[PDB]
Amino acid sequence: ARQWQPDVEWAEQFGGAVMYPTKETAHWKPPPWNDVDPPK
Amino acid sequence: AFSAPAAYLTHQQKVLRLYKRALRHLESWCVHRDKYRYFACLMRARFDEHKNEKDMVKATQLLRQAEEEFWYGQHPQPYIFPESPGGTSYERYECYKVPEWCLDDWHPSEKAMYPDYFAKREQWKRLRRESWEREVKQLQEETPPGGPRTEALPPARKEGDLPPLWWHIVTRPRERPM
Amino acid sequence: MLKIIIPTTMLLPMTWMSKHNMIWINATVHSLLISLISLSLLNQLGENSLNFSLTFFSDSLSAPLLVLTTWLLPLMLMASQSHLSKETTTRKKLYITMLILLQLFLIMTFTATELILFYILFEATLVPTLIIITRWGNQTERLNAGLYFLFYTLAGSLPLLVALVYIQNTTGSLNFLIIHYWSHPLSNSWSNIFMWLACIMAFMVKMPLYGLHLWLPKAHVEAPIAGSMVLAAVLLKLGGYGMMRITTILNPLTNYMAYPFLMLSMWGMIMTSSICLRQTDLKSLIAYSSVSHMALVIVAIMIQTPWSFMGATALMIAHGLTSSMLFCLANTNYERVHSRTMILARGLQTLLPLMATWWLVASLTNLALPPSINLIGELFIITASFSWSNITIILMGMNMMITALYSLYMLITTQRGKYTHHINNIKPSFTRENALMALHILPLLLLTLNPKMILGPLY
Amino acid sequence: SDAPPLTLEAIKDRVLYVLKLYDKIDPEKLSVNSHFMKDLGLDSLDQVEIIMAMEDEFGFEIPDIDAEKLMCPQEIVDYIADKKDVYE
Amino acid sequence: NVLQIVRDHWVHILVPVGFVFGCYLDRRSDEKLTAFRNKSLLFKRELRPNEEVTWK
Amino acid sequence: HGKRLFIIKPSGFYDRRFLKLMRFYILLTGIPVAIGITLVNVFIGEAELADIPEGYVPEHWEYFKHPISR
Amino acid sequence: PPEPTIRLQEDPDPEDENLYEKNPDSHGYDKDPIVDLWNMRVVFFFGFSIVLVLGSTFVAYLPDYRMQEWARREAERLVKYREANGLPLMESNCFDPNKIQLPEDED
Numbered sequence: 002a003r004q005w006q007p008d009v010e011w012a013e014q015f016g017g018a019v020m021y022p023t024k025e026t027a028h029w030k031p032p033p034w035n036d037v038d039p040p041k
Numbered sequence: 042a043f044s045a046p047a048a049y050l051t052h053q054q055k056v057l058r059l060y061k062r063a064l065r066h067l068e069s070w071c072v073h074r075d076k077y078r079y080f081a082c083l084m085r086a087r088f089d090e091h092k093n094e095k096d097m098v099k100a101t102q103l104l105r106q107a108e109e110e111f112w113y114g115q116h117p118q119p120y121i122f123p124e125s126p127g128g129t130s131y132e133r134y135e136c137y138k139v140p141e142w143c144l145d146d147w148h149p150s151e152k153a154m155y156p157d158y159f160a161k162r163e164q165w166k167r168l169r170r171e172s173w174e175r176e177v178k179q180l181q182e183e184t185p186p187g188g189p190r191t192e193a194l195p196p197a198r199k200e201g202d203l204p205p206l207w208w209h210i211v212t213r214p215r216e217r218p219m
Numbered sequence: 220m221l222k223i224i225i226p227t228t229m230l231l232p233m234t235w236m237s238k239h240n241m242i243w244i245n246a247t248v249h250s251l252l253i254s255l256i257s258l259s260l261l262n263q264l265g266e267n268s269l270n271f272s273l274t275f276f277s278d279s280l281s282a283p284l285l286v287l288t289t290w291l292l293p294l295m296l297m298a299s300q301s302h303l304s305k306e307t308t309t310r311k312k313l314y315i316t317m318l319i320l321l322q323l324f325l326i327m328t329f330t331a332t333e334l335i336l337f338y339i340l341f342e343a344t345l346v347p348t349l350i351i352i353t354r355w356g357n358q359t360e361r362l363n364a365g366l367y368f369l370f371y372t373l374a375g376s377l378p379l380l381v382a383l384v385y386i387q388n389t390t391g392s393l394n395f396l397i398i399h400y401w402s403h404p405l406s407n408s409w410s411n412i413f414m415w416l417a418c419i420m421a422f423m424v425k426m427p428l429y430g431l432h433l434w435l436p437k438a439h440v441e442a443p444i445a446g447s448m449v450l451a452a453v454l455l456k457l458g459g460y461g462m463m464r465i466t467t468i469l470n471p472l473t474n475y476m477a478y479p480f481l482m483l484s485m486w487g488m489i490m491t492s493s494i495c496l497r498q499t500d501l502k503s504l505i506a507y508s509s510v511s512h513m514a515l516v517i518v519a520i521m522i523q524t525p526w527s528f529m530g531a532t533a534l535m536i537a538h539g540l541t542s543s544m545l546f547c548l549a550n551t552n553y554e555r556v557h558s559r560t561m562i563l564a565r566g567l568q569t570l571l572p573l574m575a576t577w578w579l580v581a582s583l584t585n586l587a588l589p590p591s592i593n594l595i596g597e598l599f600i601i602t603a604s605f606s607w608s609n610i611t612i613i614l615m616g617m618n619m620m621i622t623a624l625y626s627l628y629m630l631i632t633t634q635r636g637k638y639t640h641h642i643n644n645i646k647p648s649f650t651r652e653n654a655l656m657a658l659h660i661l662p663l664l665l666l667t668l669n670p671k672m673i674l675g676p677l678y
Numbered sequence: 679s680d681a682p683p684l685t686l687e688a689i690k691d692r693v694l695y696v697l698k699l700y701d702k703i704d705p706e707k708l709s710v711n712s713h714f715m716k717d718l719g720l721d722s723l724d725q726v727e728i729i730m731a732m733e734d735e736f737g738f739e740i741p742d743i744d745a746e747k748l749m750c751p752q753e754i755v756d757y758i759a760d761k762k763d764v765y766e
Numbered sequence: 767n768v769l770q771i772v773r774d775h776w777v778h779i780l781v782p783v784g785f786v787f788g789c790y791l792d793r794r795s796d797e798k799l800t801a802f803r804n805k806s807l808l809f810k811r812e813l814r815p816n817e818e819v820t821w822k
Numbered sequence: 823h824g825k826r827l828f829i830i831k832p833s834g835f836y837d838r839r840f841l842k843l844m845r846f847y848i849l850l851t852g853i854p855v856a857i858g859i860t861l862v863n864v865f866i867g868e869a870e871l872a873d874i875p876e877g878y879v880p881e882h883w884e885y886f887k888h889p890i891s892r
Numbered sequence: 893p894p895e896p897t898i899r900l901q902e903d904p905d906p907e908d909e910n911l912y913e914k915n916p917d918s919h920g921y922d923k924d925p926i927v928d929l930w931n932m933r934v935v936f937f938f939g940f941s942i943v944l945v946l947g948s949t950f951v952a953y954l955p956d957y958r959m960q961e962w963a964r965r966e967a968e969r970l971v972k973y974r975e976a977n978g979l980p981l982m983e984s985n986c987f988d989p990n991k992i993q994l995p996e997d998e999d
């Protein structure tokens with residue numbers, strides 16, 4: 002009796018570095034939120 | 042229909058079911074009453090000649106040849122009572138059966154007719170409302186762990202109690218509502 | 220033609236400046252008034268057309284489609300009133316805005332006198348439908364459904380645009396009157412074959428043609444009720460209208476280019492009909508029946524005879540009304556039961572008798588019982604096909620039988636038998652639903668009295 | 679139709695009438711509560727025949743699972759009453 | 767009550783005003799195409815004593 | 823015999839009300855239409871065909887027979 | 893595993909509301925009885941009384957712009973004339989050959 006809306010599991014497919022992950026890309030990580038890399 | 046079924050039929054039940062089926066089909070073959078009486082007495086004599094036998098193996102060898110002989114001569118058009126599952130009026134009145142809950146959706150101008158009926162109906166509703174809360178716990182404690190083993194239900198054991206799951210059996214529509 | 224277009228545009232500010240509790244009333248009243256105004260287009264001539272201006276013209280092929288389009292809007296509003304109760308005022312106004320924009324685009328598309336203008340509005344009809352499907356649809360499949368409904372369509376219509384501009388660089392005009400009066404034969408050539416395919420495939424994919432029909436069940440089962448109504452009643456007929464218009468420049472290539480599609484239709488109508496025999500969803504069954512009827516319309520248009528065109532017009536109108544009614548009945552069951560599975564709610568004739576009468580009349584009309592206009596169109600198409608080839612009767616005959624079967628199947632599973640015991644929330648039918656069914660079914664039986672109105676320009 | 683509304687007394691009277699025409703059981707010994715195997719010394723085949731005579735008398739069939747556990751005239755009357763919805 | 771029900775029902779004039787404006791718009795278009803009025807070979811006619819144009 | 827029993831059935835109020843309302847509105851507009859058509863037929867209509875008198879050019883609505891169509 | 897087995901904070905699915913419960917004579921248009929009654933009235937009046945009856949009557953009495961009876965009269969006059977003068981009713985040629993210039997083949 003309720004319209005379906007996206008949930009966390011549905012929202013997680015767009016959270017990767019790219020769409021359609023592969024073996025080569027599997028180790029890629031999204032950029033930081035503020036787009037800053039620690040100086041190390 | 043009313044009785045809960047078991048896990049299997051014993052040998053005696055199978056024999057009795059064959060006896061009833063064979064007598065019914067013999068009656069369907071022998072239309073006249075005196076002929077049926079004669080051949081039914083003959084079939085009874087044929088049936089109990091092995092009544093006293095003791096071993097299971099041959100007693101099961103019988104009732105197998107008996108089923109084969111019945112299926113060979115089973116009268117492909119046997120007599121069926123009109124209300125029986127194969128009869129000419131099996132589900133004839135099924136379209137006139139209306140559930141009780143439909144009366145809850147009547148207009149107040151409709152319920153204004155028949156005030157006594159609806160007062161009694163309200164009494165029944167409140168009785169059901171209390172009895173249900175009692176029945177749930179009664180069934181919860183009376184059930185073996187792991188779930189029911191047979192779909193048979195217990196009676197009421199206290200004084201003011203009602204048999205669990207009674208509403209939809211007591212409030213059957215009718216056999217011939219209209 | 221602006222006497223119809225301007226009030227339809229004025230529907231938008233009227234909707235947006237309305238009170239929060241008066242949107243449905245005002246929209247319904249003014250849509251009914253616009254339908255009454257559009258009724259005057261039915262006065263057609265045996266001569267050329269009603270050429271109002273350089274931009275818009277009306278024909279006895281366009282007039283019934285315009286009347287159906289204007290009549291469908293109040294029914295869609297009534298059908299949408301129920302399930303949109305708990306929605307905010309702004310979103311309800313947006314829904315009504317989408318419906319109005321769809322009606323405006325359809326109105327203009329039918330009356331456009333230019334092929335390019337027709338293409339632009341024919342594509343503009345996509346955006347409101349896509350928004351309606353993917354925003355107010357219920358299940359999660361709607362998104363996928365929308366994608367299908369989009370790309371199929373575009374995959375057919377991008378070549379057409381190319382062909383269109385090519386034609387205008389060769390003939391010098393895309394005006395339909397000039398195109399008709401200056402028609403020239405198409406020689407048998409590979410370039411001409413591909414031009415034919417480009418001009419035909421966009422309209423084939425929206426009928427839909429068998430084998431290109433996969434988008435339709437998805438879109439129709441995933442759409443809200445108003446979306447299903449407009450998709451089945453009007454948007455399918457855009458391909459038929461386009462093919463009727465564009466076949467004038469495709470001769471005599473159609474004499475042999477039509478063979479692959481004709482087969483795909485004549486066999487296809489069998490398959491889809493048989494598919495209706497084994498279906499567990501009501502909306503899916505109704506959509507597949509729509510596919511079968513539109514296959515018959517495709518055959519009629521490809522045969523290219525006067526009786527074929529008359530039958531195709533009549534069948535388009537009749538199917539629009541009938542499929543809209545069937546979708547409304549299925550939705551009135553769904554809003555009570557929330558399942559959309561045929562065998563869940565059973566024996567409903569005992570609980571809802573008048574709705575059972577509506578079900579019977581809708582099933583009889585879909586079954587093409589004479590003298591309904593459904594049967595008029597079907598019989599004219601069948602006679603034209605018999606003249607085309609006497610063997611066709613076999614396939615046609617088979618379809619008829621199968622159709623009746625599944626129609627009555629749908630009537631027997633849901634209405635007859637014993638009621639489901641545990642379903643105790645089936646309330647009496649509202650006046651709104653009964654009025655919706657009556658307003659669907661009375662125009663059909665009225666139209667059977669004056670069939671010349673829906674027989675097209677070749678009457 | 680025009681079928682008279684049979685009552686519990688009519689059902690009991692007809693059941694006893696059919697049982698008294700069964701020459702295997704003595705009409706003096708039997709009563710409404712007289713058991714079949716123990717009180718009257720009958721067999722299982724005799725019980726099947728009694729059920730069949732009841733079915734022929736009342737025009738409807740009793741399923742075997744229910745019929746196999748009807749061991750008194752009183753329970754036969756109760757079964758027929760419950761099946762046919764008899765008030766009094 | 768006038769000047770109060772207006773603030774709620776002024777909306778009901780929009781569609782009829784649109785209809786009248788659309789009719790007026792249609793009339794304007796007709797004037798532009800009068801290039802062959804009373805000039806067709808089929809309906810070529812001599813004017814009446816108090817007639818300026820055959821149609822409007 | 824006072825063996826009258828209650829018949830359980832769904833409500834007929836809403837179906838009956840809808841039918842009454844639909845009949846009322848249809849008749850409300852259609853009875854005056856039928857009366858007007860009858861009066862026009864009895865007292866006015868059915869023009870008869872005639873030749874066009876020479877020098878006279880008829881109006882476009884003078885080529886039709888029924889008064890309502892005219 | 894001390895997780896709550898709750899994926900997020902979400903409202904429960906509400907139960908559907910019966911329009912007849914709070915308002916018998918509900919007509920199924922709106923939860924407000926007055927707005928509902930007037931929606932019923934306007935729908936019935938503008939759908940059945942106005943469009944369905946008056947529009948049907950208008951369509952029934954549409955004037956003969958398709959010119960069926962005109963064609964009947966013309967055909968009657970032509971048949972009368974041709975039977976009177978012995979002409980063979982319809983002619984096989986739609987255009988008289990005197991105005992067609994065929995191309996000489998000279999093959």
Ligand SMILES: CCCCCCCCCCCCCCCCC[C@@H](O)O[C@H](CO[C@H](O)CCCCCCCCCCCCCCC)COP(=O)(O)OCC[N+](C)(C)C
Nearest residue numbers: 407408409410412416423428429430431475476479480483
């Ligand atoms: C998938 C769901 C259905 C989608 C819709 C399907 C409908 C589209 C079908 C296309 C219609 C037919 C296209 C061409 C028909 C012309 C007739 C021709 O093909 O037949 C012979 C042609 O012979 C051979 O066919 C030559 C072409 C062979 C190569 C074409 C591929 C064959 C099968 C490909 C099907 C793939 C379709 C799907 C694409 C993704 C005739 O011999 P010829 O007299 O010499 O040529 C006459 C034409 N002239 C005059 C211009 C010269």
Ligand SMILES: CCCCCCCCCCCCCCCCC[C@@H](O)O[C@H](CO[C@H](O)CCCCCCCCCCCCCCC)COP(=O)(O)OCC[N+](C)(C)C
Nearest residue numbers: 283286287290662665666668669888944947948951952953
């Ligand atoms: C329910 C219980 C019964 C109660 C009712 C009893 C009475 C029964 C009568 C009902 C039907 C019986 C048939 C009687 C037919 C008589 C009327 C008929 O003759 O009129 C027809 C006329 O019918 C109309 O033309 C057809 C109706 C118009 C349909 C348009 C629909 C309205 C708009 C709705 C929206 C559109 C949606 C669909 C878009 C395509 C044909 O007339 P026609 O001989 O030719 O010429 C008329 C007279 N002339 C010569 C002066 C011109």
Ligand SMILES: CCCCCCCC/C=C\CCCCCCCC(=O)O[C@H](COC(=O)CCCCCCC/C=C/CCCCCCCC)COP(=O)(O)OCCN
Nearest residue numbers: 371374375378381382385410411413414416417420424431
């Ligand atoms: C639902 C999916 C359907 C997808 C669309 C299917 C239809 C495809 C139709 C062909 C696509 C291109 C149409 C061309 C536009 C018409 C213009 C035209 O006809 O001009 C021709 C040009 O014709 C072409 O060039 C067409 C060549 C094809 C190239 C594109 C191939 C696309 C795929 C072809 C096979 C598939 C077609 C049928 C698909 C069936 C449905 C799946 C003549 O060119 P000129 O050189 O100026 O004149 C010759 C004398 N000098």
Ligand SMILES: *OP(=O)(O)OCC(C)(C)[C@@H](O)C(=O)NCCC(=O)NCCSC(=O)CCCCCCCCCCC
Nearest residue numbers: 053056063088091092100103104107110111721722723
């Ligand atoms: O005391 P009850 O509980 O009634 O027990 C009855 C009985 C003892 C006879 C029986 O239940 C039982 O347990 N018997 C033990 C052995 C046994 O029965 N072995 C099987 C014998 S089979 C038989 O009876 C032969 C059948 C012959 C009839 C064939 C039917 C063909 C008819 C064709 C259509 C007209």
